[PDB]
mmCIF file of C-alpha atoms in Angstrom:
data_model
loop_
_atom_site.group_PDB
_atom_site.id
_atom_site.type_symbol
_atom_site.label_atom_id
_atom_site.label_comp_id
_atom_site.label_asym_id
_atom_site.label_seq_id
_atom_site.Cartn_x
_atom_site.Cartn_y
_atom_site.Cartn_z
ATOM 1 C CA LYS A 216 -103.710 -87.398 65.353
ATOM 2 C CA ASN A 217 -102.470 -84.814 63.036
ATOM 3 C CA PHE A 218 -106.031 -84.164 61.398
ATOM 4 C CA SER A 219 -107.893 -84.751 64.797
ATOM 5 C CA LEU A 220 -106.132 -81.858 65.752
ATOM 6 C CA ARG A 221 -106.794 -79.717 62.612
ATOM 7 C CA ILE A 222 -110.655 -80.709 62.768
ATOM 8 C CA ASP A 223 -110.680 -79.243 66.314
ATOM 9 C CA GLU A 224 -109.278 -75.943 64.692
ATOM 10 C CA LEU A 225 -112.007 -76.270 61.886
ATOM 11 C CA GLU A 226 -114.346 -76.383 64.373
ATOM 12 C CA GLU A 227 -112.572 -73.463 66.622
ATOM 13 C CA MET A 228 -112.494 -71.550 63.229
ATOM 14 C CA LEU A 229 -115.933 -71.873 61.880
ATOM 15 C CA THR A 230 -119.104 -73.277 64.217
ATOM 16 C CA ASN A 231 -120.079 -70.402 66.695
ATOM 17 C CA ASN A 232 -119.007 -67.919 64.317
ATOM 18 C CA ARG A 233 -122.122 -65.429 64.761
ATOM 19 C CA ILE A 234 -122.909 -65.194 61.266
ATOM 20 C CA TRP A 235 -122.449 -68.105 59.610
ATOM 21 C CA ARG A 236 -125.051 -69.351 61.763
ATOM 22 C CA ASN A 237 -127.312 -66.070 61.062
ATOM 23 C CA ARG A 238 -126.713 -66.932 57.519
ATOM 24 C CA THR A 239 -127.894 -70.763 58.041
ATOM 25 C CA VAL A 240 -130.411 -71.251 60.799
ATOM 26 C CA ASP A 241 -133.588 -70.065 59.535
ATOM 27 C CA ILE A 242 -133.930 -71.756 56.207
ATOM 28 C CA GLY A 243 -134.704 -75.232 54.919
ATOM 29 C CA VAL A 244 -136.598 -77.029 57.290
ATOM 30 C CA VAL A 245 -137.415 -81.024 56.487
ATOM 31 C CA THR A 246 -140.732 -82.387 57.546
ATOM 32 C CA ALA A 247 -140.330 -86.116 58.816
ATOM 33 C CA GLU A 248 -143.322 -87.132 56.609
ATOM 34 C CA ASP A 249 -141.799 -85.212 53.954
ATOM 35 C CA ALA A 250 -138.474 -86.896 54.533
ATOM 36 C CA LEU A 251 -139.985 -90.266 54.528
ATOM 37 C CA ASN A 252 -142.290 -89.517 51.392
ATOM 38 C CA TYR A 253 -139.548 -87.659 49.469
ATOM 39 C CA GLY A 254 -136.996 -90.242 49.752
ATOM 40 C CA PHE A 255 -134.437 -88.795 51.420
ATOM 41 C CA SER A 256 -131.299 -90.468 52.704
ATOM 42 C CA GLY A 257 -127.860 -90.444 54.483
ATOM 43 C CA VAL A 258 -127.237 -87.152 55.955
ATOM 44 C CA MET A 259 -130.588 -86.222 55.335
ATOM 45 C CA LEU A 260 -132.106 -89.173 57.814
ATOM 46 C CA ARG A 261 -129.519 -88.634 60.210
ATOM 47 C CA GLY A 262 -130.373 -84.636 60.462
ATOM 48 C CA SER A 263 -134.203 -84.687 59.893
ATOM 49 C CA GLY A 264 -135.310 -86.391 63.409
ATOM 50 C CA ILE A 265 -135.507 -90.327 62.697
ATOM 51 C CA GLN A 266 -132.751 -92.544 63.592
ATOM 52 C CA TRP A 267 -131.326 -94.724 60.641
ATOM 53 C CA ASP A 268 -128.001 -95.928 59.759
ATOM 54 C CA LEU A 269 -127.398 -98.521 56.764
ATOM 55 C CA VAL B 5 -91.698 -116.200 57.547
ATOM 56 C CA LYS B 6 -94.582 -113.610 57.025
ATOM 57 C CA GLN B 7 -94.193 -109.798 55.889
ATOM 58 C CA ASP B 8 -97.513 -108.517 55.751
ATOM 59 C CA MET B 9 -98.016 -104.923 57.669
ATOM 60 C CA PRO B 10 -100.240 -105.443 60.986
ATOM 61 C CA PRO B 11 -100.041 -102.828 63.644
ATOM 62 C CA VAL B 12 -96.534 -103.609 65.435
ATOM 63 C CA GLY B 13 -97.389 -103.765 69.059
ATOM 64 C CA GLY B 14 -100.132 -101.714 68.637
ATOM 65 C CA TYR B 15 -100.922 -98.136 68.159
ATOM 66 C CA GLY B 16 -101.689 -95.433 71.147
ATOM 67 C CA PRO B 17 -104.626 -93.360 71.563
ATOM 68 C CA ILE B 18 -106.391 -90.804 69.178
ATOM 69 C CA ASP B 19 -108.232 -87.878 70.973
ATOM 70 C CA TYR B 20 -111.664 -86.750 69.361
ATOM 71 C CA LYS B 21 -112.409 -84.287 72.210
ATOM 72 C CA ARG B 22 -114.067 -81.110 71.139
ATOM 73 C CA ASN B 23 -111.312 -79.202 72.845
ATOM 74 C CA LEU B 24 -112.132 -75.811 73.252
ATOM 75 C CA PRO B 25 -110.321 -73.943 75.865
ATOM 76 C CA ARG B 26 -112.552 -70.732 75.857
ATOM 77 C CA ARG B 27 -109.881 -67.918 75.972
ATOM 78 C CA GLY B 28 -110.690 -64.931 77.791
ATOM 79 C CA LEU B 29 -112.999 -63.630 80.950
ATOM 80 C CA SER B 30 -116.028 -63.391 81.740
ATOM 81 C CA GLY B 31 -118.358 -60.299 79.727
ATOM 82 C CA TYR B 32 -118.861 -58.166 83.368
ATOM 83 C CA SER B 33 -114.680 -58.220 83.546
ATOM 84 C CA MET B 34 -115.156 -57.016 79.955
ATOM 85 C CA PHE B 35 -117.750 -54.263 80.618
ATOM 86 C CA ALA B 36 -115.754 -53.417 83.474
ATOM 87 C CA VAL B 37 -112.570 -52.781 81.219
ATOM 88 C CA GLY B 38 -114.511 -50.740 78.710
ATOM 89 C CA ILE B 39 -116.444 -48.301 80.979
ATOM 90 C CA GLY B 40 -112.864 -47.677 82.636
ATOM 91 C CA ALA B 41 -110.840 -47.151 80.096
ATOM 92 C CA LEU B 42 -113.162 -44.894 78.036
ATOM 93 C CA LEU B 43 -113.948 -42.888 81.001
ATOM 94 C CA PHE B 44 -110.023 -42.329 81.597
ATOM 95 C CA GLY B 45 -109.930 -41.070 77.939
ATOM 96 C CA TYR B 46 -113.203 -38.881 78.821
ATOM 97 C CA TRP B 47 -110.957 -37.454 81.603
ATOM 98 C CA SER B 48 -107.982 -36.808 79.603
ATOM 99 C CA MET B 49 -109.946 -35.190 76.660
ATOM 100 C CA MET B 50 -111.400 -32.801 79.742
ATOM 101 C CA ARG B 51 -108.392 -31.540 80.593
ATOM 102 C CA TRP B 52 -106.825 -31.085 77.366
ATOM 103 C CA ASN B 53 -109.808 -28.889 75.915
ATOM 104 C CA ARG B 54 -109.861 -26.762 78.902
ATOM 105 C CA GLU B 55 -105.881 -25.992 78.416
ATOM 106 C CA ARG B 56 -106.984 -25.188 74.853
ATOM 107 C CA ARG B 57 -109.777 -22.751 75.735
ATOM 108 C CA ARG B 58 -106.882 -20.643 78.486
ATOM 109 C CA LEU B 59 -104.996 -20.481 75.143
ATOM 110 C CA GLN B 60 -108.008 -19.560 73.276
ATOM 111 C CA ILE B 61 -108.733 -16.838 75.766
ATOM 112 C CA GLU B 62 -104.966 -15.586 75.270
ATOM 113 C CA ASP B 63 -105.291 -15.566 71.411
ATOM 114 C CA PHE B 64 -108.378 -13.550 72.001
ATOM 115 C CA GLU B 65 -106.703 -11.239 74.072
ATOM 116 C CA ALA B 66 -104.174 -10.954 71.566
ATOM 117 C CA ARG B 67 -106.758 -9.979 68.634
ATOM 118 C CA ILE B 68 -108.110 -7.425 71.077
ATOM 119 C CA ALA B 69 -105.056 -5.720 72.226
ATOM 120 C CA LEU B 70 -104.169 -5.599 68.319
ATOM 121 C CA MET B 71 -106.874 -3.810 66.605
ATOM 122 C CA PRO B 72 -106.962 -0.334 67.282
#
């Protein structure tokens, strides 16, 4: 219970903070062809398109 | 008898909602408040400026009549 409230308060703190967003939006695209060739795993596969959970 | 640790009688719900209350009001109200307080300050500043203009003219009268 307490950690559900604290993670909601972290999302309050950061996450729609304007300048952290403007720090990291523009950078680091991952092509899905490169996401499968270069052997990415986990959160890279969850973020870069294709649906994949072990 | 057995003395493991099961959940005794079941545990209640645990929230996981993104609960953001969105404190504040609309932006048009924010512009209205900002322009209103700004114009209030402008009127008060105008009045104090012209009062000190009156007193500055009186100090000019002092330096004129004091000179010969």
